[PDB]
Amino acid sequence: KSLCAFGGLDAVTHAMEAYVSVLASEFSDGQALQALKLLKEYLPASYHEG
Amino acid sequence: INTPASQGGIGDLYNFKLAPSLTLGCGSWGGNSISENVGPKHLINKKTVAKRAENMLWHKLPKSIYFRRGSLPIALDEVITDGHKRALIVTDRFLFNNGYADQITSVLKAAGVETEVFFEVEADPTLSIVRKGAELANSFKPDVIIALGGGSPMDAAKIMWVMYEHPETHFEELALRFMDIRKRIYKFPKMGVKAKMIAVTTTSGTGSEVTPFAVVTDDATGQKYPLADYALTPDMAIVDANLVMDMPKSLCAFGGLDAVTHAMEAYVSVLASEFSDGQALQALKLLKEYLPASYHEGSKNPVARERVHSAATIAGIAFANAFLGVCHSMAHKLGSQFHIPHGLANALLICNVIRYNANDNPTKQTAFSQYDRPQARRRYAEIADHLGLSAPGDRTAAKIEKLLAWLETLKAELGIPKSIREAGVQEADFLANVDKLSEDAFDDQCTGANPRYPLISELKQILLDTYYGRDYVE
Amino acid sequence: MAVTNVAELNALVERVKKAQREYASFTQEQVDKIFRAAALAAADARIPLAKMAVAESGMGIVEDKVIKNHFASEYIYNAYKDEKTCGVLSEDDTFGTITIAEPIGIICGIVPTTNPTSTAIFKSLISLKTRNAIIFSPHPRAKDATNKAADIVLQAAIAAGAPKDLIGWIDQPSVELSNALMHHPDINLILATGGPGMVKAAYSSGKPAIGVGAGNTPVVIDETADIKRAVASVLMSKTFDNGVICASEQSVVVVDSVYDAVRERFATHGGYLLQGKELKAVQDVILKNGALNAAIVGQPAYKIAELAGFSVPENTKILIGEVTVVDESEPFAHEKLSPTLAMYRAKDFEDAVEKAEKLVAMGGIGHTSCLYTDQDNQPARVSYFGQKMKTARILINTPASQGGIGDLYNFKLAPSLTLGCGSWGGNSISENVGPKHLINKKTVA
Amino acid sequence: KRAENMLWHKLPKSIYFRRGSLPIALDEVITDGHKRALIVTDRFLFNNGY
Secondary structure: OOHHHHHHHHHHHHHHHOOOOOOOOOOOHHHHHHHHHHHHHHHHHHHHOO | OOOOOOOOOOOOOOOOOOOOOOOEEOOOOOOOOOOEEOOHHHOOOOOEEEOOOOOOEEEEOOOEEEEOOOOOOOOOOHHHHOOOOEOEEEOOHHHHHOOOOHHHHHHHHHHOOEOOEEOOOOOOOOOOHHHHHHHHHHHHOOOEEEEEEOOHHHHHHHHHHHHHHOOOOOHHHHHHHOOOOOOOOOOOOOOOOOOEEEEEEOOEOEOOOOOOEEEEEOOOOOOEEEEEOOOOOOOEEEEOOOOOOOOOOOHHHHHHHHHHHHHHHOOOOOOOOOOOHHHHHHHHHHHHHHHHHHHHOOOOOOOHHHHHHHHHHHHHHHHOOOOOOHHHHHHHHHHHHHOOOOOOOOOOOHHHHHHHHOOOOOOOOOOOOOOOOOOHHHHHHHHHHHOOOOOOOOOHHHHHHHHHHHHHHHHHHHOOOOOOOOOOOOHHHHHHOHHHHHHHHHHOOOOOOOOOOOOHHHHHHHHHHHHOOOOOOO | OOOOOHHHHHHHHHHHHHHHHHHOOOOHHHOHHHHHHHHHHHHHOOHHHHHHHHHHHOOOOHHHHHHHHHHHHHHHHHHOOOOOOOOEEEEEOOOOEEEEEEOOOEEEEEOOOOOOOHHHHHHHHHHHHOOOEEEEEOOOOOOHHHHHHHHHHHHHHHOOOOOOOOEEEOOOOOHHHHHHHHOOOOOOEEEEEOOHHHHHHHHOOOOOEEEEOOOOEEEEEOOOOOOHHHHHHHHHHHOHHHHOOOOOEEEEEEEHHHHHHHHHHHHOOOEEEOOOOHHHHHHOOOOOOOOOOOOOOOOOHHHHHHHHOOOOOOOOOEEEEEOOOOOOOOHHHOOOOOOEEEEEEEOOHHHHHHHHHHHHOOOOOEOOOEEEOOOOOOHHHHHHHHHHOOOOEEEEOOOOOOOOOOOOOOOOOOOOOOEEEOOOOOOOEOEEOOHHHOOEEEEEO | OOOOOOEEEEOOOEEEEOOOOOOOOOOHHHHOOOOOOOOOOOHHHHHOOO
16 A cells, blocks of 8 residues: 555546546446446455455 | 397397397286386376366457447448458348348448358258358358348357368267366367358347357257357457337347346356446346337337347347356247247246245255355345335345336236246147156256256246246245 | 077177177277267267166166266267377387287176166277277166166167177176176176175186275365365265265364364254264164175165164255274274265374374275365475375365366366276275276387 | 447457466467467566566
8 A cells, every 4th residue: 555545546537437428338337337336345445454 | 020039139239129028027817918018107106186276257258349220331341441352141031031131242242242142041050051051151262251130040150150160070079079168178179260250130139149159959869959169259240220120029029038037147147257247237227118118119219229239239248258047948948849939938937937046045955155156135136226126125035026026017018928828838748748848958058057056856846837827936 | 689598698709709800900080980979879868878777776866867977978088089099009110110009809897786877888988999899797786777878889889880799788697697707718808896895806816807996085174174165065075966976975084173163064054963872773774794785875864864763854964973993893984885974083183194094094995085174374284195195086175076166176087987996905096097908009120 | 411420349359357367367378379478567577576
């Protein structure tokens, strides 16, 4: 830490942006939401211990 | 030959590549016993150890997927610009009698390439049509194979592409080596050397243009053969929606319920990774709005139809990496034996299978229950409250009941009968052939990723309770 | 044409001798077609042979017979597809030497009750791969299944270019026709498999003989292992086809400091402990003449429980006894061929290793042995356990059976059969049987 | 005239993933069929044992 925190926030922004852009089709909304789902549980636990 | 049976002449040795006359011993006395030379390998016993090794998972797809309304002629322009000169089209004869295959040939002959059509595909592949097609293929020698249709023309094209590339490999060793995935032992011959395959779909509700599956029926014995490995997936899939604007109800309802079951199963199987849960849920999300609107009117609403089409191929992406379950196999056999169209077979079966798998914990045929799988109850609950069918304070069994109460109302207005008997199946030949289909749907790859390991006496219970129009309950 | 007396026995032995002498002149490219046709038509009839075997023998489970029949066909086909067994094998052209190969002759084959239909495909296929002939001697209880399997393979092979017969079998066996056929002059190799009764009879006959047997396979659980997965693995592998697979688990040696918890881990699941009078009621039933009572083989747990003389829940799986003495006179130390088990208590790691060696020294043939421990923290215990044990396979955190999830558990393993030895006495490790045990090679110069 | 557009969904051909899958992934480049190789990395990863 905090090399892990930088990559975590990087992936947060990459998933937060690519859902609202004007080229967002329906093949790529689901995996953007899945990426946003998988971070809010497992990111602080990976930050504190590891 | 022309040599004494002794030692010591001149030169190197007579002979120099020979052991002494001793060191050769046998192990018996009686008859026709040849001796052999004794060395250190007769005095050593060798042992082997083996640790527990972990496994790996994957996510494999075609290289490029082009999709939307009106994208067929602008997709196959890039095969004109690079660089192909000869072509072959595999389709069904109903599509050739109407004006559908001409939409490819009229565009391809404008730049000028040799084209021809093989319109002889039955509703099932019959292992002898594919040999005549392969004969046509290596008589013509193309380098682009374009499959059109849905279901049978696609996997017919896959099988007749695998033997155009290797005309010496006989079919029986393909049937013996390659029957399931999860097994990487050993390897497949290298394909894609002198041709490549394009897949164009027509019907909305099968996802066979992204999956590495094929099923071939033999003529003589009536024996099925599955073939499955990731060297049969196409190189490019085209998902257009102008090809499906005129199909009648209820051909759309069958494909809709087919995609419903393909997405419902592949979320709860025991090979479900985290790369393929999201698209299974996206496919389940996109149908509950746009399917009844596409059923009642059409093509007066040219928006819901293309979204149902796209969500069908989303579920096709989903189940090609985490595999299917039990109602798939039972649906294949129940459809192939009674000549029911495939698609309403598993429409009749899914509710009993949901009641089957949702048992609390009978530890009678479980395996590694504390290792990877949470439960099959919890994932059905996750489907139910993702799809938006829950009060804010509930328990699990209420959510499951609200889930399977929903799709019965869906099956109501899509207009399908309530048991197998109303579909027109007599009692005599069904009670004659229930024990034929009971264990025959056990070995047919289920195995499989069902969360609960079945057995044969429990499948005929389902096949009886679906024919009488009851519900599986204990 | 039936076979009951010695005269028609000698008739069909002369017939198959004439046919084998006819067959041993084919080329390499026309043996392989016979091999593919035989393997395919043997793999098609999975279900009817399992139904016939369960109907005739009266014990076993149908689905397990289906899957092990399928696996035993496909492994033998895919392992030996393209192997030089006919004609010239190797040469040294600039020095004159050529190595050629030549067959043995006629093989006798002995088939037990427990795996009646899977061994016939194995022995038939590796016989007619290497240009030989085979005569089967089934067991009187289940005999129609074995003859049906050999018949399916035979007429599969006939319509590909084979001679008029190559395979023979005995109808209505007895105790004298087997000894008549084992001492017939012009047969050359016998293949016996099963229990310790007839492999010693096959050994002491003055002919070449290899025996496919099984020993009592122990499992060692130390204190630094996971407890739930070990019990799950043992209960999964032992109940497979009621435990009639060759060399399944037979004893569990548990170190003391994690002992009692493992007890209730068998109690809150399919296992059922027994610590009182009922041990005598089950020690009087497994061993009646000193020679393994044939009334408790392949049966479920509750049927041998009620035949012992008491009641039990219906959904139970395994009967667990616990003994302290380790000798030949104790009845649980034998191999049992039934869903039963015996467990022991040890002080520490080396005591458990010593007691496991003393268990494996009783079977006569070293086949497998199992250890359940952490493998990412104690490599020294792994090396020590691999050093001291003397069996063919040594398994770490793995059940001694087949069929889990993924590819295979394990995927680089042969079946539990195909491993045979050539002696009985002491410290004899078995090894896997293939076509190189059936071919004598010659050299010219 | 006014023509409409098309969308796509493009990825690598195969993605292998999970804990402990590096040496079993690059076994298939050994089995078929390559003979020469080149590795591009940073010097910090080369100074450590990676």
